[PDB]
Ligand SMILES: c1ccc2[nH]c([C@H]3CCNC3)nc2c1
Ligand SMILES: c1ccc2[nH]c([C@H]3CCNC3)nc2c1
Ligand SMILES: c1ccc2[nH]c([C@H]3CCNC3)nc2c1
């Protein structure tokens with residue numbers, strides 16, 4: 001429909017304007033009080049802005065560890081993409097800056113915690129609930145792929161639950177703008193498509209594979225391919241073999257056989273009809289795509305928390321000091337940050 005085509009055209013216009021002239025140096029560390037570590041070359045911390053009282057989540061990266069871990073390009077991708085995107089299900093970057101030792105990305109604080117903890121607490125999500133979360137990922141990937149972006153890190157730990165029970169996707173450390181194919185070995189083993197494992201050039205089809213893994217994990221309670229050694233996981237991934245729990249609906253099994261298709265040229269999301277083969281699949285027949293986008297659907301649950309600074313839905317980590325040098329490190333490498 002022209003309304004969808006027009007929405008995506010305007011989304012690409014606005015993304016490219018920020019992509020081509022990125023914001024830089026929009027706050028400083030002294031503006032924020034440190035509250036707590038929320039997750040941990042990098043860590044995410046709850047902070048409070050000292051003039052407004054607003055809470056934020058601040059991702060901190062040690063430049064010397066980024067260089068040593070060969071993540072320079074990836075770190076630059078992450079910040080340049082995050083400052084340029086805008087979508088209801090993506091965590092919003094509010095500020096960014098750097099100092100002699102570190103890089104800082106200050107994002108909205110999403111207080112309901114990671115999907116992963118709620119999934120492991122309940123055990124599994126029933127199909128209607130898994131479908132609600134999957135619909136948000138389908139819309140988010142339609143948006144990102146239309147901007148020539150590949151996300152490359154879908155998993156429950158990267159999906160935060162907001163105050164209305166909707167998903168906010170976080171962690172763009174492997175996201176990349178790609179016009180044709182890309183080649184980097186990256187991602188999380190359980191979620192990798194066969195073409196990444198086999199060292200091929202690959203494209204946005206890897207995100208649709210990962211959506212297949214995520215839907216399976218939400219509805220079963222565990223991912224389809226697992227083992228103690230990564231090489232064993234990879235052997236299962238490339239084999240073409242998946243076993244489904246008997247409680248899966250027939251429609252769910254059908255969708256997952258088409259997402260978990262080892263031949264990328266046959267995989268749903270990567271065919272002539274693109275995302276519409278997924279949106280029109282029978283498993284999504286009850287989904288009101290516009291109502292989801294507009295946040296008009298009652299969520300599966302609302303996270304329990306006491307206020308905008310409550311951290312109860314996140315776990316406890318050792319509170320470590322940040323590194324502080326009197327000399328600038330890696331200045332040339334991070335000039336554009
Ligand atoms: C998160 C982590 C570390 C932080 N240190 C600070 C201030 C303290 C004095 N100058 C910077 N805000 C932080 C927020
Ligand atoms: C419409 C368009 C873009 C939007 N960005 C957001 C923020 C709030 C939750 N995370 C991103 N809401 C939007 C609504
Ligand atoms: C905002 C609030 C909390 C957040 N936790 C994270 C990462 C940590 C690893 N998986 C999610 N990003 C956040 C953004």
Ligand SMILES: c1ccc2[nH]c([C@H]3CCNC3)nc2c1
Nearest residue numbers: 101321322323324325326327
């Ligand atoms: C807190 C205390 C001691 C610290 N030393 C350092 C850097 C300086 C040279 N290499 C270590 N950051 C610190 C933060």
